[PDB]
Enzyme design. Structure first.
Site, PDB file in Angstrom:
ATOM      1  N   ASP A  35       0.819  -1.198   0.000  1.00 45.02           N
ATOM      2  CA  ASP A  35       0.000   0.000   0.000  1.00 45.02           C
ATOM      3  C   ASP A  35       0.863   1.262   0.000  1.00 45.02           C
ATOM      4  O   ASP A  35       1.338   1.695   1.054  1.00 45.02           O
ATOM      5  CB  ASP A  35      -0.909  -0.015   1.233  1.00 45.02           C
ATOM      6  CG  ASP A  35      -1.802   1.196   1.324  1.00 45.02           C
ATOM      7  OD1 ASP A  35      -1.911   1.922   0.314  1.00 45.02           O
ATOM      8  OD2 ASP A  35      -2.424   1.371   2.402  1.00 45.02           O
ATOM      9  N   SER A 199      -0.652  15.617 -11.999  1.00 43.57           N
ATOM     10  CA  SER A 199      -0.903  15.251 -13.383  1.00 43.57           C
ATOM     11  C   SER A 199      -1.148  16.514 -14.202  1.00 43.57           C
ATOM     12  O   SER A 199      -1.690  17.502 -13.706  1.00 43.57           O
ATOM     13  CB  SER A 199      -2.112  14.318 -13.449  1.00 43.57           C
ATOM     14  OG  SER A 199      -2.507  14.047 -14.782  1.00 43.57           O
TER      15      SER A 199
END
Length: 330
Positions: A35, A199
């Site tokens: 994770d 992004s």
């Protein structure tokens, strides 16, 4: 040193991925959920409330000659999905894919929430976010990667998740045969303890690319792609009959649909998520309403590039002094 381990979807939907991890001496192999959005390595154990164990493999520290109680240390974690676990702490030898860390904090669960109990395939979590998020008190502990880092040939790990297939976690090296083209690296902020990056935009299907900054985290422990409501609405608007269902808890779409791809930007590069990666199947057995793999982050407070996004790429988690993230197509 290096390590290399195969990671395997837990079910036919890629709801999560499990990776075998050796703990203790002799080794006890548990299948952990790696994770990159948390920083605790915790396991089902001989200390876990019996009624809360249902099929998991447990770590039994009393059977490990290298286990030592970390006296006074406790831990307690709550994840974004409302699940939780807590317990006490041992140090022991932990190996992943041939890479060994001695003195790793292994957090033994005394209690786990129902979602963990109900998932017989996941024996615990191995956190790979920054150690500043580790929950052990009163002495915070380091992640497996943080402990391994100095010994690694290069201070990196990579995630290469498969679509409906196994993939690979590598530690200490970049497998240049595992991706196509070049790796584009992008800046990381560690201010919130995550692999947080920005992004450069998105496209839906064959549509034009929208240049827009989307701050979010690379999170292997989250199944879906969670993005701003504007972006998510633009995606589902291209699927006839798709709608957001408050009763189901997100966007659903007719199972008869063919889903468009979704592209996200990494600098000037582009990662394309095929439409099929966005199908999470019937909402309930036999239903013709299917659950979408792109969902709104509104009210999560952060955008999450979970497995839906990451499995479309070869992803480098560069833990150099100034961390960065790399993405390549594959």
């Amino acid at each position: 040193s290096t390590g290399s381990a195969t990671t395997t979807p837990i079910d036919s939907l890629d709801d999560a991925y499990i990776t075998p991890v050796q703990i203790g001496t002799p080794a006890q192999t548990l299948n952990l959920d790696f994770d990159t959005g948390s920083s605790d390595l915790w396991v089902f154990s001989s200390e876990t409330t019996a009624s809360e164990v249902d099929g998991q493999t447990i770590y039994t520290p009393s059977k490990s000659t290298t286990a030592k109680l970390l006296s006074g240390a406790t831990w307690s974690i709550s994840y974004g999905d409302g699940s939780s676990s807590s317990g006490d702490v041992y140090t022991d030898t932990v190996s992943v894919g041939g890479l060994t860390v001695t003195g790793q904090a292994v957090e033994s669960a005394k209690k786990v929430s129902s979602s963990f109990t109900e998932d017989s395939t996941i024996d615990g979590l191995l956190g790979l976010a920054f150690s500043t998020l580790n929950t052990v008190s009163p002495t915070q502990q380091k992640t497996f990667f943080d402990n391994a880092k100095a010994s690694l040939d290069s201070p990196v790990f990579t995630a290469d998740l498969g679509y409906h297939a196994p993939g690979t976690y590598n530690f200490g090296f970049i497998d240049t045969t595992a991706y196509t083209g070049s790796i584009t690296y992008t800046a990381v902020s560690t201010k919130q303890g995550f692999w947080e990056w920005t992004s450069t935009g998105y496209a839906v299907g064959s549509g034009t690319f929208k240049s827009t900054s989307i701050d979010g985290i690379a999170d292997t422990g989250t199944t879906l792609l969670y993005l701003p409501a504007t972006v998510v609405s633009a995606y589902w608007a291209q699927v006839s009959g798709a709608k957001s269902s408050s009763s189901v808890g997100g966007y659903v779409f007719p199972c008869s649909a063919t889903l468009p791809s979704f592209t996200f930007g990494v600098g000037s590069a582009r990662i394309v998520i095929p439409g099929d990666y966005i199908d999470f199947g019937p909402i309930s057995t036999g239903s013709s309403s299917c659950f979408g793999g792109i969902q709104s982050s509104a009210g999560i407070g952060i955008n999450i590039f979970g497995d839906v996004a990451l499995k479309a790429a070869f992803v480098v988690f560069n833990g150099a002094t100034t961390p960065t993230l790399g993405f390549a197509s594959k």
